[PDB]
Subunit: 346 residues, 5 copies
């Protein structure tokens, strides 16, 4: 008979004494607000700024005994967001917001429905730019753990407690992909209960493990680093005497190893510790220059050393030549097997 | 006699029991809202961010039996956007908004008119920055399909259903051009009906097929890649003996093929898979270096090998020379015919 | 006696039946709104985005017979923008807004005055980022025509018509200069009457012809392109025999012509058609490389060809030398006279 | 007894006939509003956009005889910004705003106090991004004059006149420094009275003279330009015969003079006229290349010219050598003394 | 019995004469507002703009005798931010805001509670982009002191005084790290009492000492500067005669020392004074070029100077050779010990 919006105006109005400024179960046990999120979008994970943009559906559920109706014949009463400032809502916020906003296009993207016993479902759409610190000690082979944490601002622990629901506390959209990362499915859920000089305030947090796409940096960097070192060694398969081709093929490995070192730290923050993209690349710099010294070991013999005199001349340089030819794959592949299985277990 | 705005205030006011918080056909069949868009602007299609900005006219049509007037002698009653928060409107939103806004310059750019039988036309101007994932496996020769999807936020499927109208569900402005793409005319129109733990919500979506302008990358990249490979082969039409001109014309092809590899991946995301602009260009790198080995095959003879001794010296190198001269167009044009007709059928 | 604001409250209030939701001359002839703009600022003309920012004073004039007073002894009644939502105003908008805003610093920058016969002057300050497509077939020598168009949003042609006034429909500020362009004084004024499936809507538009400053690109690009070609020819005034100076002065023209080709397409969109800054510059690339082939024509004689044998050696190369010396200004100045007078008539 | 806010509500309310929509001295002499600013922050002076951000305290003073109280025992009544829309205020705006905003953090940063005779002090905090054209004919040695101008928007000259007060019309904060400029203390104060087709409107303006920091560009550019020219001359102190060291030290001056010409016009607008950073640098380009021709004048003798024949060979080249050695400081220091004292008097 | 929000409406309403426009202790002693902040986020410390973004909790405490309740049985009455414009609050602002905003997601992030004796606690969440001047005379080894200062805007010193509380006037979040800096724990707290021509206004300020991470610039710059100088000296361990290897290893040190000088001043402002990253690097430029002159001192002997003639030829050059070999670590390590212990005490 009577429509729900007319029914609900006398359920929360000045009649029946409902005050939206007062929490449920006032002067009693605290309010148990259970939460779960639905990640629509994810990404633009900046590393200069060390933050990431997410677009979620924040669903909040609690019980309000003041809103419990008994005689109206429906099981749920929805409430459009025009009258949304008229009941009590929890003062949730994010402890690492770094700017956020609602979505208000064609309607405020907000949802509210009330069960018969007073169970309240509240769902809004938020875009967050959440801050997470980035550990980059092993940069292309790292697992970034960026978190988000949900706190009360005004109510202390003895008035309002946040929880995650057991039925899927973080849902992720179906085809949610990232251009540079993989979002793992194990999502840690734990408390971050804050203590200030004002009081103690509730917190729950979710932890997202992000693992990179190694395939990009392997193409741009690790393959043009690997081939120049092989270019460095075919350069020694030049003739035995000091040819000017060793001058050009020497700087050929120099002009590439500096160019690959030019755009190497392109989009990276200025961290003090050393990462892993350069301890690969600094080794690729000294294996360039070890071929530049290898021409000097030709010129070490060529200006130092007639049937007797010329025989020691070639015999000493070949004694360096076949040793230097074998030892360059020796010093490389021992390093190259020490490099990857280090990061395979880290 | 009586003006429409005075007539409409008693048609939707507190008299006659109209409540804007309640959908039409309440406790009955769901509301059938039919939609079509008019794309004014399009583009700024970012690929680092994988989104695109669009500027549309969102037209929504439904029937409200509460608004059906009978005695007023006009066929349509317009309603200025000052009184627009006074009737019911659908809570449409975009599932991939990534930020959006209205246009409010000199007047809120909004339109509302009401037919005699209660048919309501509602038209607004929106600017969207819609997210679309970018498949870039064959980057200059790809067909990007970027979509837009229109959902209800608060009403489930048993209360509100979106549809596309048959009479031109997507209109495009007349001279709408893109700097980098071609918008095809076949626009797929289908449903994306969402299931959450809240309920099931209606969705309709439109699919835009975008095909690139290959003419830009052919000028900056494919022509300076093609000529250096031809520069690499006239470099072998140098004299037969080991001249220093082969040192300079060797690095001449090196200084260009790295410079063309420098600004190659300029404005591109860091995708893990390999695209097609570099498997053209990596082949253009090894055909540079195959001429650098071709001087080494001159120096392979020059320091290894008197009427008998000099005759085998020139005869072996010419046996390599005329083979290497013919085989370089052989290995190129077989690749070059394998490259394009692969992407002609993809 | 009675102040104007007290007089005007009974002229447009609930007394005397004035309704701001209803256009003048309702159920009669359409409203003739005449417009003119005053461009304060102009520029930041982007070409990657193909838009430009303008800052105007939009003056609108129409007649409202409901506002015609007769007994008050003043000729014009101004109205401060606090009461500006109380009379009727046209719903003008720009069909290519791409974002715009008002100016509200220290007061809403808005102006309204009402004549005795009901003539209404309405003037506001708007900042627009107007979209214009950029034709760049001849890029440093182009004339860009970027437009702006003013439409009604809610009223059709039978209710509201926009016009330009004859008395200076576009005024420009006094010292309005642009860093890269010249705004011509001939400004085309014409109609762009839109037909949608909703109805037909009025439009008037203004066309601004923008002509570039050729002096910038002549300094950075055309002078360092011209001198290297002259550097390419003094390089042939080296000694007759194959000297190593031709190796260095060969790549001297190469290291500049690629560097000038590096920052050439610096701030340009990725258009598919070829512009004019590169068909100058591609010709400046092959006149670099024609001197690199000119050393090969020295080495074509030096390894192919004793009083008889040496006389044909110098006689053939000088036969190429004096021909190549004259023909390089021949092939250049014919092109250079064909280049500019092409664009002098376009 | 009675508090000021209760006293002031009957001083400006509906009682006593005060109307905030009506200027003081209505139908009388115009309102004399005197102004002065306090510059808190200054800078981020962009040159691509040709604007600058400033953060001021705009103090406005006028007399309102309607607000003159006589019996309340205090000399000044302050007014908090909640009731600030209740009295008359001038409609000041900036004719070159290019976007501006108020500051509203923890309170609207606004100030109002009223003297006994009706003198009103009004002070607000504004952040402006003011447009100024940039003359850059002598770019590191220029004096930029960027202005700001304060106008009425709705009141003509016969109703409202702006003035600067004699007691320090522009105050500057104490430690206000700029990273690239020096703000001179002579600040010109004059009128810019505007004439439109609407009427004539008041304007006062202030002129700020900005002089650059020459010390930055002297370090990055003028010292690495000076030393390469000295590197160009010690390069001639090589041995007399045509050595290959002149090839390397020739391009040594080329690889630097183009690199210093690469990042020279880094953050500069595309002005058509020639500035002064390049007419220094273009001269530094041809003094590089004059040493490249100086090796050609060695090779002019080396392939043109036995006790008689060799004596003219060395005697002609030394006749060029000692002349070219002295003349290079001759042509440089005459230019270098002509360069700076030109800009010392401009 | 009676709820607090109903109790508080009669405590601050129109009954009991409370006026939020009037400060506590009016016409009496000034208001003593004590402050402390809690820094949540810190950083994005720009140096081109010379500012930094901070995210704080601003806690303000004062006493209001008008709000002192006696009969209600609770010790603290909280107040939700809906009724927050209903009591008096101090008009705090930041004298170097450069733009700031509140946080309003899911609730206005604001907190208010009132003790029994009228002590008021007020806590809000602010994001500031605070301006600080950057002294960069010794750039990688500097200690930046960036401040923040809290002032009243409308109340003078005889009405409102700010103080820092003794109990931890600046708290910092637990794991607050910076990518480039270290926030020291000694935080200076002092007054910055402002004198304008309006009056004198209260100020308190906090000073944050920021010390850089030297480890980043030591890896990218100081190690590739150190090794090239050692590369410059092994280059002299080439053979004694003038070899072409000294040409290539000469420019090898040139191509790196300019490349390291290319991206050196990458993200730096254009300060006029000289910093310390280049007086390290300019010395690393002339120790590159001192090896280029060292080949000229070989060619000084090679073209100037038969059993007697050749003995003085080698004896003079070895007299330069062993002196130049020892003196290069002599001139370097004296500088290198003078460089660091200068900045160790500064
Ligand atoms: C919100 O959730 C919390 C946590 O589940 C609830 O707190 C817990 O409530 C139970 C039942 O009210 C308490 O058990 C009782 O404890 C007292 C004292 O030990 C004992 O005398 C009773 O026999 C009974 O065992 C429990 O102590 C309490 N725990 C805490 C930490 O507060 C809370 O009641 C929930 N509130 C609502 C409104 O649902
Ligand atoms: C909005 O559009 C939907 C889809 O066209 C309408 O739903 C359909 O409405 C028709 C007629 O009301 C239903 O047909 C009837 O079905 C019942 C049960 O099968 C049968 O007893 C009747 O004889 C008749 O055939 C149809 O089932 C129904 N389909 C669905 C999926 O709901 C809806 O009525 C429209 N609402 C409005 C307000 O226009
Ligand atoms: C706004 O401007 C338009 C265009 O000037 C006006 O429309 C024109 O108005 C005139 C006079 O009212 C019309 O002339 C009349 O035409 C009828 C039918 O042909 C004829 O019987 C009369 O003897 C007279 O010639 C003219 O047709 C009409 N044109 C159009 C295209 O509408 C309009 O009246 C102006 N409205 C106002 C409020 O000023
Ligand atoms: C605001 O400031 C302006 C400029 O100081 C004032 O205008 C000037 O006011 C004086 C005195 O009212 C005028 O002098 C009188 O001029 C008339 C006509 O010439 C003469 O008959 C009188 O004997 C006396 O000399 C003066 O002309 C006038 N000048 C202008 C350009 O308007 C104005 O009165 C000030 N208004 C207020 C409210 O303070
Ligand atoms: C806010 O804090 C300030 C600073 O602590 C207080 O000002 C100081 O208040 C004391 C006590 O009211 C004053 O001491 C008195 O001074 C007078 C004159 O010298 C003397 O006759 C009395 O015997 C007594 O010693 C003190 O002068 C005053 N100082 C200043 C600089 O104002 C203020 O009272 C505090 N206000 C509130 C509301 O708490």
């Amino acid at each position: 008979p009577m429509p729900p919006s007319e029914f609900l105006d006398k359920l929360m109005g000045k009649v029946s004494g409902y005050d939206a400024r007062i929490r449920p179960n006032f002067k009693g046990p605290p309010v148990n607000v259970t939460c779960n999120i639905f990640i629509n979008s994810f990404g633009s994970i900046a590393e200069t700024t060390m933050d990431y943009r997410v677009n979620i559906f924040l669903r909040q559920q609690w019980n309000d005994p003041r809103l419990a109706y008994s005689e109206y014949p429906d099981d749920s009463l929805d409430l459009d967001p025009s009258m949304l400032d008229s009941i009590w809502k929890p003062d949730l916020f994010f402890a690492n917001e770094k700017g956020a906003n609602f979505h208000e296009v064609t309607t405020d993207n907000k949802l509210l429905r009330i069960s018969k016993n007073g169970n309240v479902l509240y769902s809004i759409r938020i875009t967050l730019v959440l801050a997470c610190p980035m550990d980059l000690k092993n940069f292309p082979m790292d697992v970034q753990t960026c978190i988000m944490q949900l706190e009360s601002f005004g109510y202390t622990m003895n008035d309002l407690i946040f929880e995650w629901d057991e039925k899927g506390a973080v849902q992720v959209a179906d085809g949610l992909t990232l251009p540079q990362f993989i979002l793992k499915e194990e999502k840690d859920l734990r408390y971050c209960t804050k203590h200030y000089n004002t009081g103690k305030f509730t917190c729950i947090e979710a932890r997202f493990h992000l693992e990179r796409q190694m395939g990009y940096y392997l193409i741009q960097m690790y393959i043009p680093s690997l081939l120049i070192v092989i270019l460095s060694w075919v350069s020694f398969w030049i003739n035995m005497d000091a040819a000017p081709a060793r001058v050009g093929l020497g700087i050929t490995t120099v002009l590439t190893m500096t160019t690959q070192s030019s755009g190497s730290r392109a989009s990276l923050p200025k961290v003090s510790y050393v990462k892993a993209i350069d301890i690969w690349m600094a080794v690729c710099l000294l294996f360039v220059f070890s071929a530049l010294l290898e021409y000097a070991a030709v010129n070490f013999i060529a200006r130092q050393h007639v049937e007797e005199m010329r025989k020691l001349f070639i015999s000493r340089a070949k004694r360096i030549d076949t040793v230097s030819r074998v030892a360059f794959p020796l010093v490389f592949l021992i390093f190259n097997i020490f490099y990857w299985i280090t990061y395979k277990i880290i």
